[PDB]
Ligand binder design. Structure first.
Ligand SMILES: [Mg+2]
Ligand SMILES: [Mg+2]
Ligand SMILES: [Mg+2]
Ligand SMILES: [Mg+2]
Lengths: 305, 304
């Protein structure tokens, strides 16, 4: 068992979590091609809409389902990439990218193609400007999964710099602002770069801590490239010469330090005359992401079995 | 800074006061201290106290040997921090043949005849065990002028290097010498994994408490000789957190190494591999780790 160190962060969940979950899970159970009944049940047990609501608890009620659909299909895609090579995985992603832009019509016989297409079409229909600001961060997220730097040795420092793209920090930032209708100026976005980077490390490592057993199993049974083990747990275990479980406890303490740094960075942003009302809502949203990511990771069957 | 719970209980050599006044008295008499302020600071450090905390079960007539060796190493290393890499190298390499006894010392140069008479006295008491300390000490000395210190380092690469800079090997050889504990090469091969794990504990624990002094040294002394080479600033950089934040994380990591030590020893005992000599050895390593933490917690060397 793993006991989480004390946190001042209060995780919040979107009030419409039960409705949207039943709705979005239902959609994918109708359209997505699951290999068997076991995969369908494991899909529901994962609670991909539940993590989305924990990520963006203050999302607008008519925009939360968009986020739940996007994160869900991205989870399904990334799980498929683990059985492919870097070459096969790259081809899979790059085929869905112009479709995501809406430049290429989808193959209605291929579930992943029209699901992706209809989603982005529906999102651009609701808010064209904000939905377009999610495209490139998503593409950055997807292309990071087939980056060949995963096949090269990394220290803790270089790993965190790479994982900011692999965890989709920028993707989650754009998705959050979209779902909340929270618009920020380029001056405001640049203003909280350091807060973003600190938040990204928290999201990545917390995920690493709870998803380690799943990824460790994948690295032994799946493809040698797509299922390769790339996590801070393994890296810290190597460099410090301790068990992976020991690395988890140490990394968890480090996460609490990043939470502290988040509070100080926000305080300094407020001490200086730089904290606009939009920024206050943004950094508060980032906190929800960090605590929301932890809560879900602690409880989902995706990681416990 | 509140230390996490530890099962390691520190022990101190019962003759700590007698040997302290003897060894401190020797260096105050022979070593070239610049002024009275430096002489007081030397006594305040408690270099014989940490030695008696490192090897609490050392033999009564051999504990003073260990105190002299560690004390003169502290004095030399403090001098190196005002030198360049080249100057420090020339300084160290000059004392190495003298340590072996192949070159006579300049009797007008304190460090030379102190080093010479020390090793000569140790060989007279126990020649075989004294010779087995030479190369580990030389590895320790040469690590201080290693130019890897001026180049970017990862946490893993640092711990591998710091095993030499912390002098894990010399401390092990010194412990056995002071205790008269003789172990076969095959026995020492059994505890290689335990030694490496112990080295990380000694290094990081020292890093945590000595960080403030080393930070000040890096800002005031020589840019090369006093350069900052610690896990505290390394982990801080890799994780983009403050030094105090890294300390709290590194302290947790230290307790995990204590857990691994017990696990490795238990596994060594599960198999019929823990000989009586090894049992005293692995207990001695635990004293080194617990003793190093106690001294680092309380010494004026790190607090002021
Ligand atoms: Mg992955
Ligand atoms: Mg993961
Ligand atoms: Mg040093
Ligand atoms: Mg130190």
């Amino acid at each position: 068992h793993l006991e989480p160190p004390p946190s001042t962060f209060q995780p919040l969940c979107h009030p419409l979590v039960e409705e949207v979950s039943k709705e979005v899970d239902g959609y994918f159970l109708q359209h997505w091609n699951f290999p068997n009944e076991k995969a369908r049940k494991k899909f529901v047990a994962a609670g991909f809409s539940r993590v989305t609501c924990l990520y963006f608890p203050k999302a607008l009620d008519d925009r939360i389902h968009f986020a739940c659909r996007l994160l869900t299909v991205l989870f399904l895609i990334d799980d498929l990439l683990e059985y492919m090579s870097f070459e096969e995985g790259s081809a899979y992603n790059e085929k869905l990218i112009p479709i995501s832009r809406g430049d290429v019509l989808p193959d209605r016989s291929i579930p992943v193609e029209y699901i992706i297409y209809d989603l982005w079409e529906s999102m651009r229909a609701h808010d064209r400007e904000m939905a377009d600001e999610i495209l490139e961060p998503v593409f950055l997220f997807m292309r990071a999964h087939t980056d060949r730097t995963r096949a090269r040795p990394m220290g803790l420092g270089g790993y965190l710099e790479y994982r900011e793209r692999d965890v989709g920090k920028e993707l989650l930032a754009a998705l959050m602002r979209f779902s909340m209708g929270l618009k920020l100026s380029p001056s405001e976005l640049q203003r909280v770069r350091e807060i973003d980077a600190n938040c990204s490390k928290h999201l990545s490592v917390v995920n690493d801590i709870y998803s380690y057993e799943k990824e460790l199993y994948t690295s032994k049974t799946a493809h040698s490239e797509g299922g390769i083990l790339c996590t801070s747990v393994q890296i810290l275990a190597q460099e410090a010469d301790v068990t992976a479980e020991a690395a988890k406890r140490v990394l968890f303490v480090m996460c609490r330090e990043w939470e502290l740094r988040h509070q100080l960075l926000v305080a300094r942003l407020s001490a200086e005359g730089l904290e606009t009302p939009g920024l206050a809502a943004y950094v508060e949203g980032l906190e929800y992401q960090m605590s929301g990511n932890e809560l879900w990771s602690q409880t989902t069957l995706r990681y416990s079995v």
